Ligand binder design. Structure first.
Ligand SMILES: Cc1cc2nc3c(=O)[nH]c(=O)nc-3n(C[C@H](O)[C@H](O)[C@H](O)COP(=O)(O)OP(=O)(O)OC[C@H]3O[C@@H](n4cnc5c(N)ncnc54)[C@H](O)[C@@H]3O)c2cc1C
Ligand SMILES: NC(=O)c1ccc[n+]([C@@H]2O[C@H](COP(=O)([O-])OP(=O)(O)OC[C@H]3O[C@@H](n4cnc5c(N)ncnc54)[C@H](OP(=O)(O)O)[C@@H]3O)[C@@H](O)[C@H]2O)c1
Ligand SMILES: Cc1cc2nc3c(=O)[nH]c(=O)nc-3n(C[C@H](O)[C@H](O)[C@H](O)COP(=O)(O)O)c2cc1C
Length: 609
């Protein structure tokens, strides 16, 4: 529990702001949108501010009407099982509890989600509905951003109709402005310069618990071996040492790491911009009131920023390219960049294919539009923050209490842009040699993907490819339980890979567990060993009869894990068909039976795009 800031409304009065945009964000997208809407306010006569709901007490929403032309916008993202982002849990819980009256409160909601999930945009829909039940009035339609298609475009569209609607309601009318100012530091003790740490200065050198997203633990890589036999791709097994970190975890939890961008990529960005990346500086918020004093830890160098604090590989959002347009000396190129923010027509077409589909990162755009030469300091203000990457812990704390295992596939592909893109975290992780001990800044995030409380309950695990990661922890655990004399029910693994001689992950370890009985059944689908595909859902269909017994009479818990929906949906449909046939029942009730298990904690998921 943090110490809440003072009434955000009072803060709005003191700073003459009439619009506030809260963000429910985890990976930073919603925070981005909020900040953009907040900055838009200026071009429409109003004055806004974005804010994190966690640091405030929304109850003061009831005081918002005290400000004339006041309006509140919520950009909310949804996480695992239609839940609120962690930084919006307080707000969510309040909405349900409170009975306060929001009469006079004008609002709008833009929800960030992804259609390939059960509860699509659940959080956005709930905020939109609940605020109305409390008496507040909707000033504009609920927006439904779909990250499976193109979230950025949904925001542009919604945003384009939002301001006109806001201006018409409050009767107001409709330019490059920087958020930060640059302060170069010539004389400065090195001990005051950030070098990559996320929280307090020197927090990476001086490690002191507890450890978290704000103060990550630098675990030493003790093992990094290639898991796949072939060379088609690179799948790796890493073991991080969390000894003397006081970190706790259970199989099914996730480990997050803060990677470092490819140094060569960084060098070239500086080199093409004719800038010195070793200059030490700080970007100070021009708004001396806001608590966000810097876009990232300062003072620091451009090289450290580009390396640890900024994202330089993902396709830039439309607003970033719109602000860069001013720096392209070639007219036709200034036009293209300017048009990227368009909500339709050729501008949108070009953005979707030349930037997004081609997966062009900022360096590629700087190369393909040679007249674009923006000042380095401004570019650092526009680029989004480099995020942590989650991994399903592939070990059990009952067996490896002081070590966190990671199972991952290195990302490397050819983009339509013509170059080879390299996954940030996996390239960085791949280069970590067990060895100056190789360290990975990290932290654990509790999930709800857990082994059954009672050791006797049957476990059905479906995890193709790298989706087996958490199950390696489960199996070690169940194996550990049979060794403690405890009674363990059936433990079935449905795994899939392309060929047993190419990427059969943990082939040796799994054979072991099967032999010692820790794995009641090891069912593997080799998708490419024959002309037709053989997927895990084909094996589930085969063993329908038996799985039905464990499900309907054994109380079995089902687990699905892997890359993002097809697979997860396929499975789901298989289980529908199994239940529908052996109930027996109609398809509709088959869906209901399975949906029930999901809510009754007997069908968990851990999918990721
Ligand atoms: C909850 C959760 C659990 C996860 N568990 C694991 C796990 O245990 N093991 C694991 O390996 N991963 C897992 N991940 C994924 C992991 O967090 C990273 O997303 C992954 O490792 C890639 O990150 P990166 O930094 O290496 O690449 P990034 O720099 O993040 O690039 C990734 C992006 O590259 C693009 N891309 C990938 N291939 C192509 C292509 N061929 N063509 C066009 N675009 C493509 C996509 O936009 C993809 O999102 C999990 C993710 C989540 C959210
Ligand atoms: N997609 C991306 O591929 C990269 C590697 O992912 P990964 O290593 O975890 O997995 P992967 O190696 O791509 O897939 C693992 C196994 O799942 C199979 N599979 C493909 N589609 C499936 C489906 N719809 N239903 C059931 N199984 C399916 C694959 O078969 P085939 O590949 O032979 O179809 C393969 O045998 C990731 O970036 C992921 O996002
Ligand atoms: C572990 C995980 C779970 C998710 N669960 C859901 C979900 O239930 N519903 C949904 O609509 N989107 C879901 N999403 C997609 C996010 O809502 C979407 O990517 C959003 O853009 C992320 O915003 P952020 O960067 O501001 O956190 C999930 C994403 C991850 C990574």
């Amino acid at each position: 529990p943090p110490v809440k800031e003072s009434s955000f409304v009072e803060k709005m009065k003191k700073t003459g702001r009439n619009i506030i945009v809260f963000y429910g964000s985890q990976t930073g997208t919603a925070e981005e949108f909020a900040n953009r809407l907040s900055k838009d306010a200026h071009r429409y006569g109003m004055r806004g501010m974005s804010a994190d709901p966690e640091e405030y007490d929304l109850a003061d929403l009831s005081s918002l009407p005290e400000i004339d032309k006041s309006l509140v916008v919520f950009c909310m993202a949804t996480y695992g099982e239609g839940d609120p982002t962690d930084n919006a849990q307080d707000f969510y819980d309040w909405l349900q509890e409170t009975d306060v009256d929001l009469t006079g409160v004008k609002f709008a909601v833009f929800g960030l989600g992804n259609k390939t999930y059960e509860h699509f945009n659940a959080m956005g829909k709930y905020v939109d509905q609940r605020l109305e039940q409390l008496g507040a009035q909707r000033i504009f339609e609920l927006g439904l951003g779909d990250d499976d298609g193109n979230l950025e475009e949904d925001f542009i569209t919604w945003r384009e109709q939002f301001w006109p609607a806001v201006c018409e309601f409050f009767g107001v009318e409709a330019s490059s402005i920087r958020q930060y100012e640059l302060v170069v530091h010539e004389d400065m003790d090195v001990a005051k310069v950030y070098t990559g740490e996320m929280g307090r200065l020197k927090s990476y050198e001086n490690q002191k618990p507890p450890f978290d997203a704000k103060n990550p633990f630098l675990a030493a890589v003790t093992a990094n071996r290639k898991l796949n036999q072939g060379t088609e791709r690179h799948l790796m097994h890493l073991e991080l040492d969390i000894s003397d970190s006081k970190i706790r975890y259970e199989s099914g939890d996730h480990v997050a790491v803060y990677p470092a961008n490819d140094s060569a990529l960084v060098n070239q960005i500086g080199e093409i911009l004719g800038a010195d990346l070793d200059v030490i500086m700080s970007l100070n918020n021009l708004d001396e009131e806001s608590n966000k004093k810097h876009p990232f830890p300062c003072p620091t160098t451009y090289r450290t920023a580009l390396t640890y604090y900024l994202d330089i590989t993902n396709p830039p959002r439309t607003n970033v390219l719109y602000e860069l347009a001013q720096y392209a000396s070639e007219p036709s190129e200034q036009e293209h960049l300017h048009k990227m923010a368009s909500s339709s027509g050729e501008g949108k077409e070009l953005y979707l294919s030349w930037v997004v589909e081609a997966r062009r990162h900022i360096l590629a755009i700087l190369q393909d539009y040679p007249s674009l030469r923006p000042p380095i300091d401004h570019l650092c203000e526009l680029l989004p923050r480099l995020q942590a990457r989650y991994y399903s812990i592939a070990s059990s704390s009952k067996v490896h209490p002081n070590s966190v295992h990671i199972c991952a596939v290195a990302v490397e592909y050819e983009a339509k842009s013509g170059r080879v893109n390299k996954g940030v975290a996996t390239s960085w992780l791949r280069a970590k040699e067990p060895a100056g001990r190789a360290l990975v800044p990290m932290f654990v995030r509790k999930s709800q993907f857990r082994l059954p409380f009672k050791s006797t309950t049957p476990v059905i695990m479906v995890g193709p490819g790298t989706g087996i990661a958490p199950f390696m922890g489960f199996i070690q655990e169940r194996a550990w339980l049979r060794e403690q004399g405890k009674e363990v029910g059936e433990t079935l693994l449905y795994y899939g890979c392309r060929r047993s001689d190419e990427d059969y992950l943990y082939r040796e370890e799994l054979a072991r567990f099967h032999k010692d009985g820790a794995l009641t059944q090891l069912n593997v689908a080799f998708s490419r060993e024959q002309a037709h595909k053989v997927y895990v859902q084909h094996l589930l269909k085969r063993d329908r009869e038996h799985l039905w017994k464990l499900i309907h009479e054994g109380g079995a818990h089902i687990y699905v894990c892997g890359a993002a929906r097809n697979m997860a949906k396929d499975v789901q449909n298989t289980f529908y068909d199994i239940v529908a046939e052996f109930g027996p029942m109609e398809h509709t009730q088959a869906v209901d039976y399975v949906k029930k298990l999901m809510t009754k904690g007997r069908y968990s998921l851990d999918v990721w795009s």
